[PDB]
């Protein structure tokens, strides 16, 4: 047995890492007011997306490879997109669905049918509620907690009543009241109602912000942090890289909009395939999930360009992963024992691993049997035993001469490393630094389409 190193991910963390892709949906008054941030004075009368089709949202997201949908149910403007008992500023007083509308219900039913996991975004900062005030702090917290209970206990909400993520945005406007939140109480309610549901927050929860909105994870990306270094004035670069000494497993989630804004604006176009590809490589390709926001329009529908783009993106990835050129390749180098053989790097088994206790740098050489054309290499650690690798690089033998392909810091759950297209039969993976004896479960090679 190899001894585990560092903090270990929960089962729900590993599942998210394996799922790789989650979708964000920002829809609400701001959609009708053509804005990114609302005041709380938006007229509920304007809110009438009669064409809204949540099943269409879910169907397209499922067909284009998303595994989770995080729904904004109350943005900063404080308008609530389900008929909560706790405020009259909700869809209840709007014309939508003749006043009997429930978006969380509509989405959850669709998500249930498609087995799409569900997350929920409830804004801590609330620009509408008169309870959002330093002298009503207990009252706002009780209002917030009340809605968490409404959302998380109702078997009509979620994917068959289950939520996979709760999102607690840290953003707050310059002018706003300095309300402090009852974090522990919220977290306990979430564990009561939803077990080990993942929680994105500014505190030491299971998910953290990566510290930017471009969908850019750092390299290194340590999926762990010291809770002491979090909070609302966590360093952006600390978020972006995590902590090589971190004491809790933490997913640095890469959130980004397919458009310049989080909400839909008519004058904006979605990002190009090329752009989405770059993002993909710097999120999923750095061992962290991509959370792509797709904002429905005034009609309540995904924009046609956006849908098309989502298909192109799916096609791209499908083509990318179609043939693993390293599958079955012969690998030489040191190995701890037969149970940790080199051959476990290309055996197609995520349950088999290579490992070596030899002195660094450790070199694995792959022989593909014949020259192949590729421009991506994939590596994966066994995070059940902890994240370890701190530095590595990759060399390819071209025309009898070893040349640099690429290099990186962390591997993590899964690392993709692009390089210039090469035709090569032999490949070297050189591990230069590791926090403990390195394990790898997989090395793969692909050609981008
Ligand atoms: C430091 C800061 O507040 N920056 C603003 C963004 O807030 C952060 O958002 C991230 C997620 O990207 C995370 O919640 C942090 O805790 C926040 O501090 C802000 O974006 C906010 O989050 C988006 C996903 C979206 O819902 C947006 O409407 C929300 O305000 C953006 C908004 O343009 O401004 C940043 O300056």
From TrEMBL:
Domain (F5/8 type C): residue spans on this chain: 308-448
Domain of life, per lineage: Bacteria
Gene Ontology biological process terms, A to Z: fucose metabolic process; glycoside catabolic process
EC annotation from Swiss-Prot or TrEMBL: 3.2.1.51
Keyword field contains Metal-binding: yes
Top-level EC class as recorded in UniProt: hydrolase
Keyword match Cell wall biogenesis/degradation: no
Binding site for Ca(2+): 344, 347, 349, 352, 441
GO cellular component, one term: lysosome
Keywords attached to this entry: Calcium, Glycosidase, Hydrolase, Metal-binding, Signal
A GO molecular-function annotation: metal ion binding
Family the entry assigns: Belongs to the glycosyl hydrolase 29 family.
Name of this protein: alpha-L-fucosidase
The species this protein was found in: Streptococcus pneumoniae serotype 4 (strain ATCC BAA-334 / TIGR4)
């Amino acid at each position: 047995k190899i001894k585990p190193h560092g903090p270990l991910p929960s089962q729900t963390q590993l599942a998210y890492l394996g799922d790789e892709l989650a979708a964000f949906i920002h829809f609400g008054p701001n959609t009708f007011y053509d804005q990114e941030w609302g005041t709380g004075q938006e007229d509920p009368e304007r809110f009438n997306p009669s064409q809204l089709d949540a099943r269409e949202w879910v169907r397209v997201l499922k067909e284009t490879g998303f595994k989770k949908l995080i729904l904004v149910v109350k943005h900063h403007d404080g308008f609530v997109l389900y008929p909560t008992a706790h405020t009259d500023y909700s869809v209840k007083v709007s014309p939508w669905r003749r006043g009997k509308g429930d978006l969380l219900l509509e989405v959850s039913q669709a998500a249930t049918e498609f087995d799409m996991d569900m997350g929920v975004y409830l804004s801590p900062w609330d620009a509408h509620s008169p309870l959002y005030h330093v002298d009503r702090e207990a009252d706002y917290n009780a209002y917030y907690l009340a809605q968490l209970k409404e959302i998380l206990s109702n078997p009509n909400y979620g994917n068959a009543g289950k939520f996979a993520e709760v999102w607690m945005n840290g953003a707050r406007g310059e002018g706003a009241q300095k309300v402090n939140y009852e974090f522990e109480k919220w977290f306990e309610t979430i564990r009561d109602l939803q077990g080990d549901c993942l929680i994105f927050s500014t505190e030491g929860t299971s998910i953290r912000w990566i510290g930017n909105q471009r969908g850019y994870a750092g390299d290194p990306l340590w999926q762990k942090v010291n809770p002491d270094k979090l909070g609302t004035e966590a360093e952006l670069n600390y978020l972006q890289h995590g902590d090589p000494s971190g004491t809790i497993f933490s997913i640095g989630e890469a959130d980004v909009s397919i458009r310049p804004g989080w909400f839909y604006h008519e004058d904006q176009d979605p990002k190009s395939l090329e752009e989405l590809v770059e993002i993909y490589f710097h999120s999923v390709g750095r061992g962290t999930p991509l959370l792509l926001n797709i904002p429905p329009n005034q009609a309540g529908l995904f924009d046609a360009k956006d849908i098309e783009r989502l298909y192109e993106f799916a096609t791209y990835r499908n083509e990318l992963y179609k043939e693993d050129l390293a599958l079955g390749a012969e690998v030489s180098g040191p190995a701890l024992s037969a149970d940790f053989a080199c051959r476990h790097l290309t055996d197609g088994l995520e349950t088999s691993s290579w490992a070596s206790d030899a002195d660094l740098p450790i070199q694995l050489e792959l022989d593909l049997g014949s020259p192949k054309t590729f421009d991506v290499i994939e590596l994966r650690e066994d995070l059940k035993l902890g994240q370890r690798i701190a530095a590595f690089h990759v060399q390819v033998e071209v025309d009898g001469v070893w040349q640099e392909f690429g290099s990186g810091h962390t591997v993590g759950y899964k690392r993709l490393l692009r390089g210039a297209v090469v035709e090569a039969q032999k490949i070297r993976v050189v591990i230069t630094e590791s926090q403990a004896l390195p394990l790898l479960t997989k090395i793969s090679l692909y050609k981008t389409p």
